[PDB]
């Protein structure tokens with residue numbers, strides 16, 4: 001007879017609580033928003049015992065494991081509701097063909113650049129080396145980004161043909177892995193050449209690239225919407241744009257989708273679906289939440305069009321439309337560790353590109 005919702009503390013839960021007051025107005029049903037610690041850890045525990053919230057908000061990737069254990073109710077928005085959101089967003093909340101959540105927001109890396117050092121951002125990765133030599137002439141470098149984590153290097157590695165797992169029907173073929181193809185090989189090779197030609201240092205991490213961009217020492221960086229508040233502070237005159245192409249192919253960053261799922265154990269599923277489809281996933285619902293804490297790019301086409309007047313948000317969506325939805329399956333854990341190792345190894349000379357990737361491919365499909 002009520003609704004309890006769980007959302008992370010770093011989100012606009014005050015705005016969500018406001019959509020809830022509006023719901024309670026035309027229904028009498030009280031909505032309760034909470035943001036417990038490590039709720040994504042707590043969820044699986046309480047839900048397994050038929051407890052927890054009616055609805056949970058989290059990035060889509062985690063939903064795969066939840067769905068596996070039957071913790072989420074199957075959703076059935078009709079065609080009409082479905083057409084209100086970007087098609088690609090529905091792919092993120094499919095677990096073996098079944099729709100298990102509603103897409104809310106979209107996140108993807110973008111190319112961030114210093115408008116004072118660089119008039120126009122490069123359109124290509126191939127032109128970075130040359131640009132770096134011109135900038136070096138003035139004591140500045142072209143680009144610095146986190147080389148340590150595959151989340152950051154994947155856009156380049158995947159550009160010309162790499163992929164984690166072949167997807168073709170709301171289902172992932174776990175024996176169709178794309179880390180050892182020519183595509184990925186072309187990409188990693190380009191990256192390695194950057195480091196050995198000294199256009200990039202193999203030890204650049206998150207902190208180092210971030211400080212460098214914020215100190216105006218480097219012209220570009222690769223980062224996500226969470227990094228914007230830090231740049232603002234810095235007082236750098238920055239722009240956010242589409243990532244560069246490689247071999248004429250778009251960079252393919254992984255896409256994370258903020259999702260809302262219904263507890264399979266809830267007695268209030270009809271209430272949940274009504275709250276979600278008719279209160280929250282409306283221009284006014286996203287707006288009340290966004291006002292509290294920005295969502296970034298959103299899945300609802302109508303509101304995204306309003307938000308896209310901010311070129312940083314437009315760029316985020318563009319990159320996301322060209323990226324790779326992050327697989328929600330358990331085998332993804334193998335991919336993280338394997339590809340992490342392959343890149344650090346190829347980068348440090350410890351192994352060749354051909355070797356490093358052949359190995360990773362092996363450990364994933366193992």
Ligand SMILES: *[C@H]1CC(=O)N(C2CC(C)(C)N(O)C(C)(C)C2)C1=O
Nearest residue numbers: 035036037038039040041042043045
């Ligand atoms: C209180 C707040 C919180 O997040 N937890 C969890 C979180 C982590 C991920 C550390 N966890 O695994 C357990 C041990 C389940 C505790 C709290 O207990």
Ligand SMILES: CC1(C)CC(N2C(=O)CCC2=O)CC(C)(C)N1O
Nearest residue numbers: 203204205206207208209210211212
């Ligand atoms: C002060 C500076 C430039 C950054 C620092 N750092 C971060 O900035 C974030 C996390 C961290 O450890 C670590 C090192 C030793 C590289 N140094 O020197």
